Amino acid sequence: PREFVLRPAPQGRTVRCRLTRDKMYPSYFLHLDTEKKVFLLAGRKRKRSKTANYLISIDPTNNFIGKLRSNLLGNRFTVFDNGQNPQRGYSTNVASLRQELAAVIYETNVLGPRRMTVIIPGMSAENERVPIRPRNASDGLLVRWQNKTLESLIELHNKPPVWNDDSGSYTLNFQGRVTQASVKNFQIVHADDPDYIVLQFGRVAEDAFTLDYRYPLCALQAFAIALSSFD
Numbered sequence: 001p002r003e004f005v006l007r008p009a010p011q012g013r014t015v016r017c018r019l020t021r022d023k024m025y026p027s028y029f030l031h032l033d034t035e036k037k038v039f040l041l042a043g044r045k046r047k048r049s050k051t052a053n054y055l056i057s058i059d060p061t062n063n064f065i066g067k068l069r070s071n072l073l074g075n076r077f078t079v080f081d082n083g084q085n086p087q088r089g090y091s092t093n094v095a096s097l098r099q100e101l102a103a104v105i106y107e108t109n110v111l112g113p114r115r116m117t118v119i120i121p122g123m124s125a126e127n128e129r130v131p132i133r134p135r136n137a138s139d140g141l142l143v144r145w146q147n148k149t150l151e152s153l154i155e156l157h158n159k160p161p162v163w164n165d166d167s168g169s170y171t172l173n174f175q176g177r178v179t180q181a182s183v184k185n186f187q188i189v190h191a192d193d194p195d196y197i198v199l200q201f202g203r204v205a206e207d208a209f210t211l212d213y214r215y216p217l218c219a220l221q222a223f224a225i226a227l228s229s230f231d
């Protein structure tokens with residue numbers, strides 16, 4: 001589990017999951033969408049934070065594995081593993097410092113779907129993550145993004161919906177994985193391949209969603225990115 005939720009998905013495979021929330025500060029749960037519904041991750045928003053802050057766990061009853069934190073404004077998020085914030089203790093061993101696993105920037109709509117940018121660490125030819133572990137808040141994923149120093153990173157965006165002449169709607173082909181309209185419905189792709197669906201999220205019921213991820217993402221990145229879409 002601890003291993004699994006941090007491993008990039010296998011080449012050529014789509015890992016399909018079911019994300020549920022309590023029917024505020026609801027809990028969220030992620031399971032593999034197999035007939036043996038194995039539990040992966042859970043998260044919940046902390047009430048006593050100045051900004052949106054979700055703790056993520058590999059124990060659905062409580063194992064702290066990561067955190068989703070928004071900026072003050074609320075339109076930008078960073079995903080961290082379980083390591084220490086360097087600003088809270090400069091003498092801490094570098095290996096114990098938190099890494100940044102993803103960032104999400106949402107465009108703000110006029111007072112519907114929001115356009116999204118997702119930035120993650122780059123991968124080696126070994127197909128493992130090249131970790132980003134800032135020694136202070138003068139570096140990080142959002143920082144590199146705004147500076148446009150994207151060498152060690154991967155940039156992704158939500159795929160624009162297209163006209164479905166059969167359903168008379170602007171939508172995406174979710175392959176039956178998404179059955180209800182929602183501002184949370186999305187596909188995340190790279191510019192180089194609009195058909196390789198890195199992350200798909202969408203509603204199947206009042207409190208249930210599907211979340212399907214592919215390489216280079218792991219389950220923790222996928223889950224946290226999906227959580228950022230709630231609000």
Ligand SMILES: O=P(O)(O)O[C@@H]1[C@H](O)[C@H](O)[C@@H](OP(=O)(O)O)[C@H](OP(=O)(O)O)[C@H]1O
Pocket residue numbers: 112181182183184203206231
């Ligand atoms: O306030 P508004 O303008 O009506 O926007 C909706 C509101 O946030 C609902 O709470 C939310 O449903 P949930 O509480 O179920 O998340 C819905 O998501 P939806 O598009 O998935 O229905 C939003 O579109």
